Nucleic acid binder design. Sequence first.
DNA 1: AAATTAGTTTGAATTTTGAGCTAATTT
DNA 2: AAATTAGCTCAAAATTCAAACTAATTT
Lengths: 98, 91
Amino acid sequence: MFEQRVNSDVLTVSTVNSQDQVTQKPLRDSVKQALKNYFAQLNGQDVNDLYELVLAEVEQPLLDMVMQYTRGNQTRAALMMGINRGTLRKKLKKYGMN
Amino acid sequence: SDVLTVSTVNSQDQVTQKPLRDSVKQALKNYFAQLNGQDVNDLYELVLAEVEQPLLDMVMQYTRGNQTRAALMMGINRGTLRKKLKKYGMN
DNA sequence: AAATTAGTTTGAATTTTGAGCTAATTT
DNA sequence: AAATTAGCTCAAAATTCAAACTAATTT
């Protein structure tokens, strides 16, 4: 009665395919393509912050959406994110969203 | 100005970059839409695993398996990296 | 009026980090 | 032959955490 939804089809993105059909692909792939383009535009320059970079690039929308969803309620936001409320307030401060 | 972008196409077959954060945001909007007031519990680990896996995979590819250089690139400790590789069973 | 939340501290648990070591591997 | 890396420990630095508690908000 219940079809398996793979972890990878939970957070998905609308894409256009070789037959100009709209399909949902994993967010993984967005991250992969972004990273491939980032790597492609390096030309052997040295990197030391890739994790923080991606992490910021991903934490910011997450907080944005979860704050919109809870209508500013940090406790609920923290509770649905699965993190301590203080950690959440910290992150919110980090991205100037309080 | 945006180092992490993905490629989009519009109805006029023009290709254009867009920040990865727009993708993440879309995916979340879709997530919140798909569930109807069902409770979310571990959204951070969800997304973080969802973002950490292809990152590790791509940096390990870029450094041809060299964990020390991968770790240096990412700006984390080699131990942390080994741990993360263990976590997603890629080692 | 109750309840819930924000804003803050405090100390414990967990995680990340660096550094040191030898074995194995790459150069 | 040398240099680098992996696999591994130790403990200490940093971060996350829960538990308070009152003021302030919301219900």
